[PDB]
Design a protein around this ligand. Structure first.
Ligand SMILES: Nc1nc2c(ncn2[C@@H]2O[C@H](COP(=O)(O)OP(=O)(O)OP(=O)(O)O)[C@@H](O)[C@H]2O)c(=O)[nH]1
Ligand SMILES: O=C([O-])C(=O)[O-]
Ligand SMILES: [Mn+2]
Ligand SMILES: [Mn+2]
Ligand code: NA
Length: 621
């Protein structure tokens, strides 16, 4: 025990587990950060049910969460209204050179990520972390992204002072002692989180929800294999395995190592004949992945099974199959809109062992939100997400627009049998899409891999409530990755294009969808949800080589009568499927200006070529 005093030994403060049990480098990480942050206690998480019960009890007793008595082991957290979603403007990546992280925009102000210099980050770090956990417990969370012990899994350690983060990580990752045993003396991603409210409190606590909005900063240091997040408890900012690791850090590793880390669901779809295919889909935040990934198809005999709803790690095997795995262990899903009619499999999943954040509570201990589509007995009352009595005729919603459920994937009734298979599932189609109220038809198919990459690059979508963006501003969200690129977007495009030069590659067919086109009065032209199975059927047939497509300037679309619209006789097909020369001339000009300004010297030639080819096809209309 080599030391002149007690070294950096924090053993006296350990209230679960043992520092002696930890791999050497894990111990160093814990003790170095204990020295810095000065927690009152250290809790080494074991991931056991016993621990989870006591953690929930502790939070309940502290008033941080409430038990929802109507359900089996479900809980409700209500946050400070300042800490409710991601904050892109406070999310940064540190590298030696800015251009490695983001292209330099011609006009000023990049929209493909925020870079911070090493020097500026050190100052930011020193202004936040020293002493930040005083009076609190530092929890040590050993977690695996991907199935335990898989050669493709990646392990992290997250230190946090938030028991809400511990509970949510238990759901969203594989966590506990088994992860430490699989880790051994291997490398792990170093993840440090604090709510940034050391005791005694310097500022008023709102709704018993510790946070520091003024100093909120979600930082990524890929060259140090570190993620450092301060001031926010909201899951996208605090669950460091999810967006921070499994997209931002992992996307750059993937570029270096020949794979892909993407904001994509993975689903398996089986037709009435029993033939099954796996598909991946990238839609922006709050644009429909969870609803698609566990859809109940309206077409009789069709079945969808869920591999993952949010993040995909994909790599070509030796046979050329693009194999995908879900690195998550749960769903962190948008609550509003979820009903028996729109997402019955989510309703089944969230009946037990689920943590809800910022939803409303009924007087009989249930959950409520806009679009839940379940009448309450007369006399039953509602407490809004703001902890105030609420009525249906009220101006503001009962649930926050970005309220979430956090639920075990193992509870999904149609979880796919291969959802934890270490080798992944073979992807036969990749689907892009987002919210476009005008101009973009229900579905089209890219003409080639290069055209498909351009389609991903050109994605635009109405702003949602998943981050700080207000109104329904149509924003660029290439590959649904705008908030999540771990490195220069132009390099990411080159990396995707390079997949076509892999010998033997079985390149997935690429499609683009729009569930959200609206008529003149602002009403949806397409009902969506389970009806989207009709679009998946067409995709399935196209992968099988069916002659069910008509060429248009934007790509292939369904032939007349090719889509099954039985039961949707009132859909206005000409409006929904319409392609206007005027709209598309404007669209290509907008994309050209965006790529030139935002990507410029980093833009691959093949992307510029696809833009010109699209413009040329439009000119022949
Ligand atoms: N009109 C319509 N709304 C949909 C459709 N699919 C999903 N939604 C709604 O869009 C919102 C977000 O859908 P999700 O499936 O949770 O979005 P996501 O892509 O999983 O979002 P993140 O988890 O933030 O990445 C919810 O309110 C849904 O009810 C659809 O087909 N049509
Ligand atoms: O939380 C999410 O999944 C998001 O914002 O994409
Ligand atoms: Mn997401
Ligand atoms: Mn989702
Ligand atoms: Na609260």
């Amino acid at each position: 025990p080599p030391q002149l005093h007690n070294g950096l030994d924090f053993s006296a403060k350990v209230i679960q587990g043992s520092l002696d049990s930890l791999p050497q480098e894990v111990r160093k990480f814990v003790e170095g950060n204990a020295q810095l942050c000065q927690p009152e206690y250290i809790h080494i998480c074991d991931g056991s049910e016993e621990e989870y019960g006591r953690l929930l009890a502790h939070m309940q007793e502290e008033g941080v969460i409430r038990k929802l008595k109507k359900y089996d082991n479900c809980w409700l957290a209500l946050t400070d209204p300042r800490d409710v979603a991601r904050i892109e403007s406070k999310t940064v990546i540190i590298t030696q050179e800015q251009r490695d992280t983001v292209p330099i925009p011609k006009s000023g102000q990049s929209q493909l990520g925020r870079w911070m210099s090493e020097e500026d980050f050190e100052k930011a770090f020193n202004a936040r972390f020293p002493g930040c956990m005083k009076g609190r417990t530092m929890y040590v969370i050993p977690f695996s992204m991907g199935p335990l012990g898989s050669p493709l899994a990646k392990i992290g350690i997250e230190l946090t002072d938030s028991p809400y983060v511990v509970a949510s990580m238990r759901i969203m990752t594989r966590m506990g002692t088994s992860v430490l045993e699989a880790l051994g003396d291997g490398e792990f991603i170093k993840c440090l989180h604090s709510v940034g409210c050391p005791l005694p409190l310097k500022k008023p606590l709102v709704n018993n929800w510790a946070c520091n909005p003024e100093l909120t900063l979600i930082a990524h240091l890929p060259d140090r294999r570190e993620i450092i997040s301060f001031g926010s408890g909201y899951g996208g900012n605090s669950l460091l395995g999810k967006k921070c690791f499994a997209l931002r850090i992992a996307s750059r590793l993937a570029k270096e190592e020949g794979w892909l880390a993407e904001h994509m669901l993975i689903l398996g779809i089986t037709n009435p004949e029993g033939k099954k295919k796996y598909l991946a889909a990238a839609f922006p935040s709050a644009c429909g992945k969870t609803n698609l990934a566990m859809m109940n198809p309206t077409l009789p005999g069709w079945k969808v099974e869920c591999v993952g709803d949010d993040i995909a790690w994909m790599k070509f095997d030796a046979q050329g199959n693009l194999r995908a795995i879900n690195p998550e262990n749960g769903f962190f899903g948008v609550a509003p809109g979820t009903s028996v009619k729109t997402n019955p499999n989510a309703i089944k999943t969230i009946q037990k062992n689920t943590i809800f954040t910022n939803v409303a509570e009924t007087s009989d201990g249930g959950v409520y939100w806009e679009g839940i589509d379940e009448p309450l007995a007369p006399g039953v009352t509602i407490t809004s997400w703001k902890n105030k009595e609420w009525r249906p005729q009220d101006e503001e919603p009962c649930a926050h627009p970005n309220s979430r459920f956090c639920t075990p994937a193992s509870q999904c009734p149609i979880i796919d049998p291969a959802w934890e298979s270490p080798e992944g599932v073979p992807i036969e189609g990749i689907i892009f899409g987002g919210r476009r109220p005008a101009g973009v038809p229900l579905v089209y198919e890219a003409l080639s891999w290069q055209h498909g990459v351009f389609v991903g690059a050109a994605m635009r979508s109405e702003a949602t409530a998943a981050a700080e963006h207000k109104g329904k501003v149509i924003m660029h969200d290439p590959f649904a990755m705008r908030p999540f690129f771990g490195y220069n977007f132009g390099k990411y495009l080159a990396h995707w294009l390079s997949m076509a030069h892999r010998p033997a590659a079985k390149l997935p067919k690429i499609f683009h969808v729009n569930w959200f086109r609206k008529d003149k009065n602002g009403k949806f032209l397409w009902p969506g949800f389970g009806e989207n199975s009709r679009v998946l059927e067409w995709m399935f047939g196209r992968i099988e080589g069916e002659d069910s497509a008509k060429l248009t300037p934007i790509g292939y679309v369904p032939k007349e009568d090719a889509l099954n619209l039985k039961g949707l006789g009132d859909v206005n097909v000409e409006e929904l499927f319409g392609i206007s020369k005027e709209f598309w001339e404007k669209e290509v000009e907008e994309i050209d200006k965006y790529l030139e300004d935002q990507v410029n010297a980093d833009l691959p030639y093949e992307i510029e070529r696809e833009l010109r080819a699209l413009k040329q096809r439009i000119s022949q209309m």
